[PDB]
Structure formats: structure tokens, C-alpha cells
Design a protein around this nucleic acid. Structure first.
Length: 121
RNA sequence: AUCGCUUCUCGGCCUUUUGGCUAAGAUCAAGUGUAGUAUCUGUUCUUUUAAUAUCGUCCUCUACCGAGGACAAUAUUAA
């Protein structure tokens, strides 16, 4: 179940962070260029220095577009059958009756049987 | 088994949805006839007399101009 906005974030982060692959060439290049400060503390100096080249920002933009697509596929539309006896006259009435069947559907299980058998019992 | 695309079923999001209050706010009813508007169907224009109304000249008043009177036919409709 859902239970939190942070647990779905954590699941989504584990997915993205397992999908990524690091490049050791760029890593060792920047390590050899930066030297002493490549293992920084909270307070070293480099906060206002990095300028990423075009390939890095292109990779970030493509990854973020894929992430936006994965987010937009979150609520899949359930298929609409017209064989069920419809009990709504609007477009919002159908979804409100669906919410009523979600919440009160466990309790109001005898009266629907009474209705379908002819208002008896 | 694994990765990808396409049918098919289903779960979770679906308050993303009923946006107040008072004396359930109160009450609980109709027929006929005319007038107006809209739609549909059918078919038309351009190239004498009766009634009503009112530019020129002359006269008077006041400071060429203005007002008032009179006179000279004109317009409409029908055969």
C-alpha cells in the first residue's frame, strides 16, 4: 500500500539509482585534476565552481524526461464497459458512485441483493 | 530464465468528487385564448382627379443682414 509520499520516493530512487552506470574515465580524470579536494568535507571550498559540459546536461535532461514519462504513467485507466447497469447521469457522478462502491460497498451488500431479487427480504 | 514490443485480466492511487447557514429556509396548483415570432412556400423589380403641409419680387419694422405678411405653382394617392 501507499502509506507515505516518502516510501514511493525511496522506491523510485532505488529504481533510478540501480539503473545508472558510472563512467570511470571521467571519474579518474576529474580525480586526477582535482587532487586533494576530490574527497571534500561539508565545508571545503568547491561550492560555486563546477561547470558541467553539454554531454552531462544532455544525459540529465534525457533521464529526467524518462522520469517524467514514468510519473505520467502512474494512474492507468481501467477499461470502460457499458454492459453494467449504469446508475449515473453525469461524468462526475460515475466516479462518485465508484467511490461509494469503494467505501460503503462492504456494508451495503444485503440491500443490493434485496433490490435485485425484487425489493424483498 | 533473461531483455524488449504488442493483446488480456487484475490490484493499489482514484476525498482528482458532492464547496456553508436558517422556520426539512418556505410553498406546491390550471386552462384557454391571443399575440408574436419563426419557418416554409410561392412568386415579383430594374433601365387625370381628391385630401394634407409649406427660389424670385413688392411693402413695413430693427440693427448688407433678420423677422412678418401677398403674389407666381409644387408633392403625394387612385382610374
Amino acid at each position: 500500500g501507499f502509506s507515505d509520499y516518502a516510501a514511493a520516493q525511496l522506491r523510485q530512487y532505488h529504481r533510478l539509482t540501480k539503473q545508472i552506470k558510472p563512467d570511470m574515465e571521467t571519474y579518474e580524470r576529474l580525480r586526477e585534476k582535482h587532487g586533494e579536494e576530490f574527497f571534500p568535507t561539508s565545508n571545503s571550498l568547491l561550492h560555486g565552481t563546477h561547470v558541467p559540459s553539454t554531454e552531462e546536461i544532455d544525459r540529465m535532461v534525457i533521464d529526467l524526461e524518462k522520469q517524467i514519462e514514468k510519473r505520467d504513467k502512474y494512474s492507468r485507466r481501467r477499461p470502460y464497459n457499458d454492459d453494467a447497469d449504469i446508475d449515473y447521469i453525469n461524468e462526475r457522478n460515475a466516479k462518485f458512485n465508484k467511490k461509494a462502491e469503494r467505501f460503503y460497498g462492504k456494508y451495503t451488500a444485503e440491500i443490493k441483493q434485496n433490490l435485485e431479487r425484487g425489493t424483498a427480504v
